[PDB]
RNA sequence: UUUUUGUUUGCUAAUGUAAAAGAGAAAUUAUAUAUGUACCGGUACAUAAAUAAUCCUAUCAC
RNA sequence: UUGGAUAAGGUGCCUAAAUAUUCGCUCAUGAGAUCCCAUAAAAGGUGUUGGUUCAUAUGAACUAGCCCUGAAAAUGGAUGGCGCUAAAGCGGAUUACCGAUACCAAGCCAUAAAAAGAAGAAAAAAUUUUUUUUUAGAAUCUUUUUAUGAGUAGAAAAUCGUGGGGU
RNA sequence: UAAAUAGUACCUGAAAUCGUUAAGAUGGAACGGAUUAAGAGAGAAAACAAGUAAAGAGGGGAAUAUUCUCUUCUUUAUUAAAAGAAACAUCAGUGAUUAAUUUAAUUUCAAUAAAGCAAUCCCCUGAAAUUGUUUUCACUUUCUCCCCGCACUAAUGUGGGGAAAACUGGCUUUAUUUCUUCAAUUAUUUUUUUUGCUGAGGAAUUUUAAAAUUAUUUGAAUUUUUCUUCUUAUAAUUUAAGUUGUUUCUAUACAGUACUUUCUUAACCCACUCGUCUUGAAAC
């Protein structure tokens, strides 16, 4: 057959809905999530990061340790370069 | 009549078809495999009451309102033959540069807006439009200078389309007349022409 | 007083360059005072070129260019234009308008 | 078409046959440009040739 | 520069000369490929009489045929016959080698052929 | 760049950076005429520049010296010279942008009643260190041979004379209508008066 | 030197722009400070510190 | 051929693009400015910047960046020139840019391969009837698809002409 | 004499070369390649006009030397349509752009207005008693105050020696986030603002199918409803199935200043005398 002009499969709607059969079901969805209200996140923000607390204190305890950890090695260092001075 | 593709809502228009090419084995085909085409649709900022300045015409500089839209894009303008001595000239949005001033928010100026949108319907693009034979009998005289162009100048007058319009925009002024002449800085606004002063920048100045 | 403009001038410049290779497709514009590329984006229009003639060419001594400006060129606010002919070189220097329509 | 994007997206039973049936990727020069083409990545100083992981779809994007 | 006239799309005007026909008179314009050794127009220098090659033909579709948007064809005596059917696609032009007479009577039934003439006042 | 002339007052200016503008604007077809090329200044010590320019008078085309490389000492010419050697004069364009240049030591007449710029991409204090070594161009002319410095300096202190007078006479000229446009302020509508205030006008 | 019509046998009227579209803008001077005012480079006081990021100047006929 | 976006390389002018940002060093009375590439050393410097080791903000000893000496050749001479010091020098970091007969998208040519082939009405203009254009079937061909496209010695094919000769 | 531009160098009479006239150019080479622009020549076969009525000249053939036909040019009026280009719009591809965007992840935070903690102490950090565990002191704001210099400053203040709480700052509580931030980056989606270039082909048994859109109807569904989805059946639209339409101009003319083209001049960029043997040619 003749070669016509290849639409473009990622922007021209038809051509993209006849290659994925799925895709005006999977924008559909994403319509719907995009078209929500606002007030639900402005009163779930804080209940989605007071509820991360025990993570943050985790993620504090962590790279606490890791810094005690190079502390020491800078401490460890420091003493051996003392011992070796004399 | 329209088609929601991701919804754009676009807006369908009937559309003919002229265009005549040889087909590739016998006869010929018409080109415009289509019917419909969607509709021009326009600029944010144009609508009925503004204010505008045509860019091109020989009428160049002269600031206008808006009147109304023919069903083509192209907008039909009215700087009052009275005030800016300016017909009626259908032209087009980005021909006509249009200001952020609308005629309506004057107070005095808000209470003829019913009558100025109900004198706008009647006109339309075949009232715009130049006749064929009107057009034939104004080349017949060009096969001495100052008779030509009276000729031309009253034969367009005779123009059995043109007086219709005349009597429009002759309604149109006398509407306009008063409350925009009481208004001295707005009236002057209307009259004086637009130009480019070398101390002030395109770019930087939004419109 | 009379005769208004209510369009910008430009100066016209070399082609679209590159040392010891010519390009002679595109035509490069200054204009009167934008400076930036940012701002020099704001015009996508189009271009006249006007010059004169020592005799009359089709009634009157005047016949012009039109053109495009396609795309700014480099950082300091100077511009591609593309027209319906390529300009002779005769024209480096002169004055060409860029028209406020579109 | 979406059968090949998970097949190619994970490492599933066909290759030999997607990878033989899909012709070479012609990809347009980068937006922006490359960093250096005579120098490492991992260098310090600029460069591009090596090991990207996870980083290839940045330069994909201006690839396309 | 490539000249576009309607649907016949030129590629290339200035019909080719030979190289250094400029400073000698002994070579005459018609061109020819140089052989040489170090002969410039071999190596294809920048900008220096480039030779011509395939890709300058034009299209097939669209080839041969004249501004008239047909096809010219060569007439000398009477040969009309095999004209009648295709004169929308075929124009004629009278062998120069043709008497007065004869280019008379040509013209006059072509005219009423209705089919056009390239040098229709030859030679009067 | 737009106008029909520039005239370009040369006090404390670098000479390559002066020239880089100035040759700039003159190969877009701009007309551009320098004043007061004694005042020129070179970044670098006076005995470094005698030094080089010393260098440059013994070059010498040893077959004829009128053929020669023309040196030169006015410092007017100096400018012209460089000016000329780093634009493309050597083709017809080139040759138009070096002749629509036109500079003349110390003050000429035709030039003092026209208003001077000065390129803020050149200035010395801009452009320099406070503590590392400068040169006035005027200088190394006399050094080199110019011998007509005094004289533009006496000019100079002569002109200055009538700059003052008649600057101290548009000052009180300015002064006066500035206050005959304050008074008359008043005498307009308020819709105008307002009009004007709001926008410091 | 002023006005109008023009420059659309080798000849016997006769035309060309490297750049009109407000082509507007006269203090000098020092940069780790200046300029004006009244006195004798110094004394005292104002002016200047995003300077053109400004000001002036155009449409109102007849 | 038409547009887009790049490579190396450059962004003071010549010369298309940054007097771009930002971080330090450099005063040269023969500064310095890209590999091939168009020379510079042993030794020094109480020039200046930063360090290390020791001694009671000081004394010494080292250490490495730039710079100075070492450093002299004949037509007048070259970082390419101009010139460049709050660099347009040095060594980075950063974005933005300009930059190809390379790359990408589209069109056309030719070659090679590939898929396939040994008989019917369309449209327009006048006013249902006339006119206006075609109604195609050539196998070393016709329609269509893709890819590629450099060349001396060298070989082959299709070709275009010249003196004659049958047809 | 047909020709004397066939006049005894006598059929034609090119080139190197030279002469005349005209036009143009001319600053140490000239000529050129590619792109033009201006001039000077030419040019109607697409560069608008088929037919329709009349009359002038012609012509033909069929009908049975008279009817009818087809007519081709000059004029008259009588009207088309179409072709190209420009502008606008639309679409598709193709980019450049100018404002964004749901939901997650990554020690982010920052405020709001009501309490408290702590004084060289607090969230941090710094120094000392087979690895983890614990401890000590030493850490900040000031427009607070004292003593010495008592005016010593870069200072509308100040050096040194000492006092002070705690507005500054830090931490633990409650309610809010639009008074104020919700950053930056990655994964998964979503649009948007201004516009440049291109428009190949023309589908008598795939320009069809479905693909989507609208408007019905069918049953159901779920993220839970005005772009929510999956078809039962219907009719068209096109985002499907490579650019189509509108208005002008060419232009109401038969050669022109317009239009296409040749030539000469200039203009920005580039370009070293060819052929040859040669590793190496423009070669001194």
Redesign the pocket.
């Known amino acids: 057959?003749?070669?016509?002009?290849?639409?473009?499969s990622?922007?021209?709607?038809?051509?993209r809905?006849?290659l994925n059969?799925?895709?005006?079901?999977?924008?559909?969805?994403?319509?719907?999530?995009?078209?929500?209200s606002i007030l639900?996140?402005?009163?779930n923000?804080?209940e989605?990061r007071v509820q991360?607390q025990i993570?943050?204190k985790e993620?504090?305890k962590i790279?606490?340790?890791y810094?005690?950890?190079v502390?020491?090695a800078?401490?460890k260092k420091?003493?051996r370069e003392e011992k070796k001075?004399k | 009549?329209?088609?929601?593709?991701?919804?754009?809502?676009?807006v369908?228009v009937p559309?003919?078809?002229?265009?005549?090419?040889?087909?590739?084995?016998?006869?010929?085909?018409?080109?415009?495999?289509?019917?419909?085409?969607?509709?021009?649709?326009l600029?944010?900022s144009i609508e009925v009451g503004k204010v505008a300045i045509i860019l091109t015409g020989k009428h160049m500089?002269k600031r206008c309102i808006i009147t109304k839209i023919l069903n083509?894009?192209?907008l039909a303008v009215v700087g009052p033959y009275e005030i800016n001595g300016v017909p009626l000239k259908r032209v087009?949005?980005?021909?006509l540069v249009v200001t952020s001033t609308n005629i309506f928010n004057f107070e005095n100026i808000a209470k003829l807006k019913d009558d100025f949108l109900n004198y706008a319907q009647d006109i339309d693009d075949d009232s715009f439009?130049?006749t064929?034979?009107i057009?034939?009998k104004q080349?017949?005289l060009?096969?001495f200078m100052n008779n030509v162009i009276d000729k031309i100048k009253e034969i367009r007058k005779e123009d059995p389309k043109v007086q219709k319009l005349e009597g429009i925009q002759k309604d149109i002024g006398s509407l306009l007349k008063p409350e925009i002449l009481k208004n001295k800085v707005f009236a002057?606004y209307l009259?004086?022409?637009?130009?480019?002063?070398?101390?002030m920048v395109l770019h930087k100045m939004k419109f | 007083?009379?005769?208004?403009?209510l369009y910008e001038?430009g100066v016209?410049?070399?082609?679209?360059?590159?040392?010891?290779?010519?390009?002679?497709?595109?035509t490069?514009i200054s204009i009167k005072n934008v400076n930036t590329?940012?701002h020099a984006?704001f015009y996508?229009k189009?271009v006249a070129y006007?010059?004169?003639?020592?005799?009359?060419?089709?009634?009157?001594?005047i016949?012009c260019?039109?053109g495009?400006?396609?795309?700014?060129?480099?950082?300091?606010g100077?511009i591609?234009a593309?027209f319906?002919?390529?300009?002779?070189?005769?024209?480096?220097?002169?004055?060409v308008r860029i028209l406020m329509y579109? | 078409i979406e059968d090949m994007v998970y097949q190619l997206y994970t490492c599933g039973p066909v290759f030999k046959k997607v990878n033989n049936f899909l012709w070479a990727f012609?990809?347009?020069?980068?937006?922006?440009?490359?960093?250096?083409?005579?120098h490492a990545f991992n260098e310090?100083?600029?460069g591009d040739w090596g090991n990207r992981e996870?980083h290839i779809?940045?330069l994909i994007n201006?690839m396309? | 520069?490539?000249?576009?006239?309607?649907?016949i799309?030129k590629?290339?005007?200035?019909k080719?000369?030979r190289f250094?026909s400029?400073?000698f008179?002994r070579v005459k314009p018609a061109w020819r490929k140089?052989?040489?050794?170090?002969?410039?127009?071999?190596r294809?220098?920048?900008?220096?009489?480039?030779m011509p090659?395939?890709?300058?033909?034009?299209?097939?579709?669209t080839?041969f045929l004249?501004?008239?948007?047909?096809y010219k064809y060569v007439v000398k005596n009477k040969e009309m016959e095999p004209l009648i059917?295709?004169?929308?696609?075929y124009?004629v032009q009278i062998a120069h080698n043709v008497s007065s007479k004869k280019r008379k009577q040509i013209i006059?039934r072509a005219?009423?052929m209705?089919v056009?003439?390239?040098?229709?006042?030859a030679r009067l | 760049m737009?106008?029909?002339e520039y005239v370009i007052?040369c006090?404390?200016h670098?000479?390559?950076?002066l020239?880089?503008?100035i040759?700039?604007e003159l190969?877009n077809?701009?007309?551009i005429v320098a004043v007061?090329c004694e005042?020129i200044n070179?970044?670098?010590?006076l005995?470094?520049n005698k030094?080089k320019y010393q260098?440059?008078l013994?070059?010498?085309?040893?077959?004829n010296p009128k053929?020669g490389?023309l040196h030169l000492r006015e410092p007017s010419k100096?400018l012209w010279?460089?000016?000329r050697?780093?634009?493309?004069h050597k083709?017809?364009?080139?040759?138009?942008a070096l002749k629509?240049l036109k500079v003349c030591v110390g003050m000429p007449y035709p030039y003092?009643?026209?208003?001077?710029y000065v390129l803020?991409?050149?200035?010395?204090?801009?452009?320099?260190?406070?503590h590392?070594?400068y040169c006035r161009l005027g200088t190394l002319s006399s050094r080199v041979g110019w011998n007509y410095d005094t004289l533009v300096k006496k000019n100079?202190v002569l002109?200055?004379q009538?700059?003052?007078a008649?600057?101290?006479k548009?000052?009180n000229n300015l002064n006066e209508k500035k206050e005959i446009?304050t008074e008359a302020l008043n005498l307009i509508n308020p819709e105008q008066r307002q009009v004007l205030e709001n926008f410091?006008?």
């Open positions: 057959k003749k070669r016509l002009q290849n639409k473009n990622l922007t021209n709607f038809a051509v809905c006849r059969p799925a895709y005006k079901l999977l924008r559909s969805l994403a319509v719907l999530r995009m078209r929500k639900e996140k402005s009163k923000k804080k989605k991360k993570q943050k993620l504090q790279n606490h340790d810094y005690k950890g502390a020491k800078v401490k420091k003493k001075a | 009549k329209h088609y929601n593709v991701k919804g754009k809502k676009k369908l559309v003919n078809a002229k265009k005549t090419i040889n087909k590739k084995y016998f006869g010929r085909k018409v080109a415009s495999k289509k019917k419909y085409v969607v509709q021009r649709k600029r944010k500089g083509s894009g192209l087009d949005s980005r021909y439009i130049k064929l034979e057009k034939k080349k017949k060009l096969k002057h009259k004086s022409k637009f130009t480019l002063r070398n101390d | 007083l009379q005769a208004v403009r001038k016209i410049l070399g082609y679209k360059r590159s040392q010891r290779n010519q390009d002679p497709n595109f490069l590329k940012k984006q996508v189009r006007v010059y004169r003639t020592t005799k009359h060419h089709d009634g009157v001594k016949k260019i039109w495009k400006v396609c795309r700014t060129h480099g950082n300091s100077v591609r593309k319906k002919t390529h300009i002779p070189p005769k024209a480096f220097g002169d004055r579109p | 012609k990809l347009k020069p980068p937006r922006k440009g490359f960093k250096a083409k005579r310090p100083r600029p996870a779809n940045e201006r396309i | 520069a490539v000249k576009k006239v309607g649907k799309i590629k290339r005007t200035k080719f000369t250094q400029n400073r008179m140089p052989r040489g050794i170090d002969c410039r127009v071999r294809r220098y920048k900008g220096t009489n480039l090659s395939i890709g300058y033909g034009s299209n097939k579709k080839k004249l501004p008239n948007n047909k059917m295709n004169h929308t696609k124009c006059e005219k009423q209705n056009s003439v390239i040098n229709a006042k | 737009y106008k029909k007052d006090k404390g670098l000479l390559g950076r020239a880089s503008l040759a700039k190969l077809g701009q007309r007061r005042d070179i970044s670098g010590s005995y470094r030094l260098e440059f013994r070059l010498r085309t040893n077959t053929k490389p100096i010279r460089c000016v050697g780093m634009l493309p083709t017809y364009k080139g040759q138009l629509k003092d009643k026209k208003k001077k803020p991409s050149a200035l010395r204090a801009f452009r320099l260190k406070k590392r070594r100079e002109r200055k009538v700059s003052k008649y600057y101290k548009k000052v446009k410091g006008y």
